[PDB]
Amino acid sequence: AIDFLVNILELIKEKQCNINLFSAISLTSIVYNNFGEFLSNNQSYSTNNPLLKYHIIILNDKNKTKDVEEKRNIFKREVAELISRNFKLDGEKVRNYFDSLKEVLKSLKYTIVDVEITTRTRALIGVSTSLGKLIFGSGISFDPYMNLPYIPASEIKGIVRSYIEGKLGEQEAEEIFGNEEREGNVNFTDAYPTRSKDFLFVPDVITPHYNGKKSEADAEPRPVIHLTIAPKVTFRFLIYYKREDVGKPICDSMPIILIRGLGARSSVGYSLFELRKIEVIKAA
Template identity: 40%
Template sequence: MYFSYNTNFQFINLYSILQLEGIIMSILRLYFNNKASEKKLDDFENLPIAEIYKNYIIFENNQEQRYYIKDIYNLKKRQIAELLSINYKPNFYELRNATNNTKEILEKLKYSLIDIKIKTSSKTFIGVSTQFGFTIFESGISFDPIFNAPYIPASEIKGILRSLVKEEQDMKLAEKLFGTENNEGILMITDAYPISAEHSIFLPEIITPHYTSEVKQETEVNPNPVILLAIAPGVTFEFLVYYKNQSLDDKEKEIIKNLIFKMSKEGIGAKTTLGFSQFKVSEISWSVGN
């Protein structure tokens, strides 16, 4: 394993580390998916994977050094999820500074700003179809390799807000705020980055699918727990909505405020209908450009 329980993740790039771990997990999954999960590691003694895992994984039957592929695969996923939950913490000071610097630049350019802070109230899944973490957990997460932190893409926030306006059957306002294929809307949005956390940033989440395409009847069900990586409850994200002054009237400003509260309540990300990816608005502040 490339990191341990003593690793300080503020001094390494988590993106690079998990990409390396992902390569090994991909090799492991190759054997796992090829019906080799019941075979033991010594059956592959001529392949690099055998030596890698004899060096890094310790089981109760360590003296015999007979490791089942499926056990290694599941154990490694659990270990990585636990390590991230315990040890990973982004540089919140750097992330807050980045947002403040963006605010200063936009204010100098005479933009009006809405500074929004939202806090996760449940385990949250953002960017499940992205590549980061996918090779390990088979579910991705939006992650910025420069800031070494998870984030909520501006495009996702904008898409949700736009769909909420459409639900109100106000297409004219939707086009004004968010634009059309041919015209740009007046609202612009930044990515949302974590600026604080009550406890961990990440937590493992275990789901147990009971049915697959191969199951034909109830007696064939074989529950298989799957470990996913989620953003923990209590993580505060900050993002900016900005626009040129005089673009919005008071009624439209109130609508935008209500949309932000509604978006947070209904959820941002995946599995919202199951109670995941829920947020609460911590703060909304406005500053008018001059």
């Protein structure tokens, strides 16, 4: 119902790790995309909904539609700040998940290699995925049932494989990861954030001026507020296999490829990671 929508911001502020962030952002996107309408005596006349203060601020009393536009921009920034502040990491379910999965893989007689990597700068993984896409035009790869951002197993595998190509040749890359005729020997799980020092998300901006622009006459900043993954967030994922003589390349490839980027726009130093730990458990 509509009261769900008028209260979604309060619910974000008061649950902070226990609401579905995916659906929460999807719902508050309706508020963001009907902002001018949710501010015509249709705030349910509450007292905690952040929609109140946008009746108290007078940004432009001359023209009301401009006023609603500026209020909407302020509200976009405020939604970004809200999500970054309130939605924090509780990575105990993640440690439980990875420990149980490790036991499962041990029972299946796999050699497990559990890798912990910490982000060093603000990371962008899944920038074209849907999360905040309907508010920010930019997304984060988000698992809506772990209720966490994550790094897909396919990206980790692809980055490791492109490095192993660039180093040991396409033939060894196919001897490890397979081709259209043989299946790979190395399995990757998704990477989930297990611990953090502070905020899990933070706001950021990109402001292209001269992107696909003829001349300075075409120049104009178009700022893009969006969410990123805060620094010092540790992610964890597993690497399991059976054939022993495939652990050597993996071992070598992990420390290097994380220094270079792992998500989006690493060319300007965004998605850089440190190797926090690597443990190897040989099936005995």
